[PDB]
């Protein structure tokens, strides 16, 4: 109650506790992960002998990364909102394209997600920060003044000090994000002085999202504290925590989740060690009766590779009548697809965070959403639900299976309908429109390349009645 | 009779006894399961030697997740109600897709079922709690006042203190669920003070569904009590207990059933010890032989781990492989899904009850527009999920293919030999192609084809053929 300075010391204590715990545990875990990944010697390699370390989680990354790269970055249909059917065309799909086109091609593209994945799969925590800035260069026509933007960036979760007692984004009572915020930022804030820490003061700062009792009242909101060095802070009633804290496997009830490294490292160890010993033995046979090594010791390298596969990418090779429907059922219900489902579900919260941060106030600007025109997106509704089920282990029938099945069954059935029944008696041009439209989107081009609409229009009067009933 | 404070003491001692028994037994079992699963050294690995643990249950878990995910999380047809056929189209499938659409994509998605599986396969007890809340943002058009919701959340069965003498949900006379219910929830309830346990008071609380007599009368209904810290409680009559307490294998009569751990643990232990011993012997030979058949029985161990749960040694070990090799070689995990759905029938009844008492006036997204308030459904007291699992339960990939083939063949045969109208007609050939459209993935829109008796039907089945 009435806390204005004890909050600073309590936040310092919480920051120090997060330092100790998160730094020690997670930094040691991610350092082991990095040491295994980079393939530098483990430290047990004696001088005078080839200390060969075989990188095995690297190809694991080279395997997991492409599949996810296809699965997410394919159209702006990855995450719909699925609100009521009435207000779909004007705000569901419009806001969906708004958020996708402001994320894809307008928030750095996918490389932010790329580094996010690497953070959750190499450095054991995938988490990013969303915040706001302004735009300048007014007409001084070219009136661009006070234009606001909202954008996301990787936090380097080593600089994401937090208690482990959250296990989810909306459970951390104390979120500390570490930054530099150098002398230029100090001048912009207005602090005339500095802290212990020349424009290169390499000053360090912390942003704390935390809840306490500072007024002697009910449950206070989250508060954003720019606790830098116990100096002039930027405290503000915060509303939404802009982070995601992935774990890469939906591990048990703890904040930081085990890495892919943790489930591949052992394989790598064995692999490296054994091949070392093998050529080591080969070496001790060259220099010189030392028993020789048959080719069978190399045979279990194959089962080690199979273990590396079947851990996540259960297909040992690239991909291990009806032409193997759905691409052998999404490559045999791949574990990567399950993790992709998890990641899309986690990013649903992020899309909500951005939808909020733009529905408060972003700008009045329109969309290039297949057409010209979009009202101000500082007043859309969140709808509280973002639907992304059709991308992954769910229905998720991928393009090169759904499209081929649709084209084949649709064409054969439509020709049967035309020959036997006809066009207008059964499904007509206006619905055959949609029926071939599925092909058009699955061909990649819906609106501009394939207009096809002809619903009820100056064309439709002469493309469905005047043309047909007169002839 | 006349119990106001002795109820608190009785619930405290019940909570303490449940802590003792459940904590000890289930916690030790689930800790052994977690230590086997996570693959950390068992503790017998002496320093100076590689304490490698061959995780052999993790592949079992990663195998049983996806099959359950397809068999349960697929469409709104997982659990029908099979009521009287008169009120079939009026309420049966309407409420079926209602609870499906509120449970999937509206009740946390499927992740609650994922944690449910985990609760029953390394926490050894798959149990969750269903409860209610309210909705806000009124007119301050946009009238959102007193709107209510019903939802299910996992209870972390360590925090599901309960007598083991139940063996089923509707058998426990004392179901205690441990929560935190911190100072925020204390302020919401209205308590001015706290207990022994600064906003971070980390207070602990318990919700008890118990049967007691406090009035000196006949049989009393269940009571929900918010015994927190021997302090103010939230007592309320309770109608239906919202828990599931899975066992994952339909074990003999005990509340908490054996895990997938209890049946793959032997395989994992044998695998780990022999692989460690093989590398140890290799190292002693290197510093100063072993036959290769020790690695040969690694395959036998993998097959034993399969046969235990995933009985096919491989992923799945004329007539085009009828029913996908007789329902995936009549999988045991299919039986697990069967009893999982049987247990979730009670959960769906709980949800339907809690929404039928009062949820909201909102309309369904069940393939159409138009549905009255779902505070007046009929539960039908039976939730039919027979077309999903070890029952009839044929999978789509085989059923749709064979049925489309038979539809094509018999439709062509009837057209050629008998005709199109004297036998099964266009309006029934509608349905006959409609199951094909159903299993194609899209139900209503892309294949409407209705043509029953309508302005499109009058020119589509009446005058387009008899007058031409």
UniProtKB/TrEMBL annotation, chain B:
Query: What's in the keyword line of the UniProt record?
Result: Coiled coil
What cystine pairs are annotated?
176-208
**Entry superkingdom:** Viruses
What is the name of this protein?
ORF.04
Q: Tell me the organism.
A: Pseudomonas phage PaP3
- Its gene name is orf4
């Amino acid at each position: 109650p009435m806390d204005d300075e004890q909050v600073l010391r309590h936040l310092d204590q919480l920051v120090n506790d997060a330092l100790d715990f998160n730094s020690s545990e997670l930094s040691k875990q991610r350092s082991e992960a990095l040491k295994y990944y980079f393939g530098e010697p483990f430290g047990n390699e004696r001088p005078g002998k080839s200390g060969i370390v075989s990188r095995d989680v690297q190809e694991t990354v080279d395997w997991i990364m492409p599949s996810l790269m296809k699965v997410f970055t394919s159209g702006g249909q990855v995450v719909k909102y699925e609100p009521d059917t009435a207000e779909d065309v004007e705000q569901a799909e419009q806001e969906t394209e708004y958020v996708n086109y402001l994320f894809m091609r307008k928030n750095e593209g996918f490389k932010v997600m790329f580094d996010w994945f690497q953070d959750t799969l190499m450095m054991k925590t995938g988490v990013v920060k969303v915040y706001v800035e302004e735009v300048l260069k007014p007409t001084f026509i070219r009136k661009d003044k006070k234009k606001r933007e909202i954008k996301v960036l990787c936090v380097k979760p080593e600089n994401f000090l937090v208690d482990r007692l959250a296990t989810c984004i909306d459970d951390a009572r104390f979120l500390c994000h570490r930054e530099k915020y150098t002398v230029s930022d100090l001048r912009l804030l207005g602090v005339p002085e500095d802290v212990i820490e020349e424009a290169n003061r390499e000053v360090w700062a912390s942003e704390c999202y935390t809840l306490l009792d500072v007024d002697g009242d009910g449950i206070s909101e989250l508060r954003r504290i720019l606790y830098v060095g116990d100096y002039i802070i930027s405290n503000e009633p915060w509303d939404c925590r802009p982070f995601a804290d992935l774990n890469a496997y939906r591990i048990a009830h703890k904040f930081h989740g085990m890495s892919v490294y943790d489930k591949i490292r052992d394989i790598q160890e064995i692999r490296s060690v054994l091949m070392r010993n093998i050529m080591d033995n080969i070496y001790r046979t060259n220099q010189g009766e030392t028993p020789q090594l048959s080719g069978e010791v190399y045979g279990m390298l194959d089962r080690l590779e199979a273990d590396r596969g079947k851990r996540t990418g259960i297909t040992d090779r690239t991909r291990g009548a009806a032409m193997s429907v759905n691409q052998l059922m999404t490559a045999a219900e791949q574990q990567i697809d399950l993790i992709a489902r998890m990641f899309a579900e986690t990013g649903v919260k992020r899309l909500f965070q951005l939808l909020h941060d733009h529905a408060i106030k972003y700008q009045n600007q329109e969309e290039v959403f297949q057409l010209r025109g979009k009202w101000v997106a500082v007043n859309p509704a969140n709808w509280r639900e973002r639907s992304d089920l059709t991308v992954t282990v769910g229905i998720g029938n991928m393009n090169k299976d759904q499209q081929m099945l649709h084209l084949m069954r649709i064409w054969e059935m439509a020709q049967a309908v035309v020959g036997g029944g006809g066009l207008g008696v059964l499904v007509s041009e206006q619905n055959l429109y949609n029926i071939l439209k599925e092909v058009t989107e699955n061909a990649g081009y819906k609106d501009p390349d394939r207009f096809w609409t002809n619903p009820n229009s100056p064309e439709a009067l002469q493309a469905k009645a005047i043309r047909e009933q007169k002839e």
